[PDB]
Design a protein around this ligand. Structure first.
Ligand SMILES: [Zn+2]
Ligand SMILES: [Zn+2]
Ligand SMILES: [Zn+2]
Ligand SMILES: [Zn+2]
Lengths: 375, 373
């Protein structure tokens, strides 16, 4: 038969719980108790979910229960119950998580090393870690490559400031080549074979073929107004990045083209954004007015908006829970933490079709899934 | 005299259209029983329309065949036509032709079907049924008086097969099992046939005895990943496989360092080899680009945007482009726009868009050049 399966993973803002919900009909598949409130990341394969618990000093790992086999003209889908895996990563203040092609790099803001591992080992229940020295504890990022990593460089005068650039290291932590300076580095995302790190002058763009990774700097277009990016997302089916650019602007970046940057002005301040992995021409931004906004990436504009929640005006209460967006199959999911629900929209009509009740303050959300044959 | 033809299956309708590759003109439309995957014979004389949901494989005389004088070669050009021969059985799957021997797998049967290409064009339905122990999603490779067949999982055959073995044409085991967990992916290139699995490749060769299977493990220097789908060089001996969805591996079975990795810009939608200029292969990626692979250099040598993006997320059977090479052109189906894009294989410049009613999807090309008089 032919089976479609998608799952939501939803972290509570206050309680150390991750809920798993069937995205297609909203029923509860599992509740996992962890140590602290979590931020969530999925692997590219979708087979693992990582729950980063900064205040608890741990990263927990969940087997999503959905995995695929690439068989050319068809795909197979393997479906099992979601489960908490034995793999935990421990260290002071876990921060940015980056996974690509099964390679995993977990940053720890309070440690002098990042932890590199692999998804295939994790799924088998093996913990096989490489600790890579990052010189001094700082709020940084590590990007995993074949036999190398790219790591942020701590500010040499006060490591509590933002990092000052990035460098290639081998997996013994040995610097390779020259430092790529990028003052005020913060923000990271991948899109296809290109990884981006944002800073005050532009983006660092990283690729790897059959040698060490190569870092190039793309400065912000001179046609842009003053600003810089501190948070990034990356297209899935098409190569691009979207960054913030001040609190009510975003930029769209094409790393494959010379006419690289386009500015979109939002009517109110940005709460969250995500790309649509299924409909590659679209991304979504949620704004403080309570509206979900459809971004037409190729036209470089907001193509439509719809009210989903009451306003979450962020001026003055920057720390409180706010909506987060996920996409699964042909639906868009928006958490409404203050109402203990998730709003479900049809992606193409851009209208609400259902809502899912989730006790607590459902906050961070990621989705995995697809369809395949079952023989 | 030159003649090339394209056979194009609709994604949803039981239709196979035939187009003259040189001017784009529609030549024929064949109505079959269900939506078809398409395979061609090595000779190009026959096209096979595998209709999984319909329980049948139909056979089409392409209308282009070659016969010799020794060497030389004449090109015999006729209208394409449906042939009476049909293979029937539950859930036809993998088609493997090797040297005019054809092996058709049926996921729902306990036997695979072996036949000759010649015997099809001559109207003969002489099917040899080779027992494969239990129904499973496997593969059979035909040899002279033997076949190599996948081994079903002994627990439940519903899982992926666990290896391959040589059998006689009754299905009686010959020799020892070649274990290869999670076996899937099959292609031939020159004197070697490859099956991929989670530990590496099985490589099959044959002289005057049973075929011989050896295991080529993935090089320990490779990143984590595995291969589950393969294509084989035609005119140069190599294999190309996936290695996760946005990478391919190039495999040279004659080199001790057999594996070379290539990073794709985005995830792979389809790939084929170039049978005319054998040092090239082509990968279509979800970003809508066609990528030329220079196999000798081990690199992507050029890329061009051909379609809108077709993300590999969604459903596995959302309609997406497929590639075929004919003469000095490359053809890319664009199912959601009811058309085929034509590019010059050297310059990668688009020369034509051929509209085809429906959702043109799977595509294969046959043809060549010979004398007539
Ligand atoms: Zn298959
Ligand atoms: Zn399969
Ligand atoms: Zn941060
Ligand atoms: Zn002649």
């Amino acid at each position: 038969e032919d089976v479609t399966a998608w799952r939501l993973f939803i972290a509570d803002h206050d309680k150390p719980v991750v809920n798993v919900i069937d995205a297609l009909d909203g029923d509860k598949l599992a509740t996992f108790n962890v140590k602290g409130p979590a931020n969530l990341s999925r692997s590219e394969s979708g087979a693992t979910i990582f729950a980063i618990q900064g205040s608890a000093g741990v990263v927990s790992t969940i087997a999503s229960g959905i995995a695929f086999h690439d068989h050319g003209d068809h795909a197979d889908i393997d479906i099992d119950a979601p489960k908490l895996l034995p793999l935990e990563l421990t260290g002071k203040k876990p921060g940015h998580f980056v996974e690509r092609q099964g390679k995993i790099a977990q940053w720890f803001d309070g440690e002098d090393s990042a932890q590199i591992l692999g998804e295939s080992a994790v799924l088998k229940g093996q913990k096989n870690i490489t600790k890579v020295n990052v010189v001094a504890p700082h709020h940084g990022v590590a990007v995993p490559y074949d036999n190398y990593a790219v790591v942020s460089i701590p500010n040499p005068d006060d490591a509590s400031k933002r990092p000052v650039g990035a460098r290639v290291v081998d997996l013994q932590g040995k610097k390779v080549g020259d430092d790529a300076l990028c003052p005020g580095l913060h923000g990271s995302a991948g899109s296809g074979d290109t990884f981006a790190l944002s800073c005050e002058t532009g983006l660092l763009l990283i690729t790897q073929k059959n040698a060490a990774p190569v870092i190039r700097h793309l400065p912000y277009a001179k046609t842009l107004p003053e600003g810089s990016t501190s948070t990034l997302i990356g297209g899935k089916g098409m190569q691009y990045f979207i960054g913030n650019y001040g609190p009510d602007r975003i930029i769209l970046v094409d790393p494959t083209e010379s006419d690289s940057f386009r500015l979109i002005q939002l009517p109110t301040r940005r709460v969250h954004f995500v790309v649509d992995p299924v409909r590659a021409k679209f991304a979504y931004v949620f704004t403080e007015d309570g509206k979900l906004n459809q971004i037409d990436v190729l036209k470089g504009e907001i193509s439509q908006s719809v009210r989903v929640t009451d306003p979450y005006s962020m001026d003055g209460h920057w720390n409180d829970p706010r909506p987060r967006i996920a996409v699964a199959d042909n639906k868009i999911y928006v958490t409404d933490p203050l109402k203990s629900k998730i709003i479900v929209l049809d992606a193409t009509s851009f209208k609400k079709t259902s809502e899912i009740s989730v006790e607590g303050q459902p906050f961070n959300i990621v989705a995995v899934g697809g369809s395949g044959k079952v023989h």
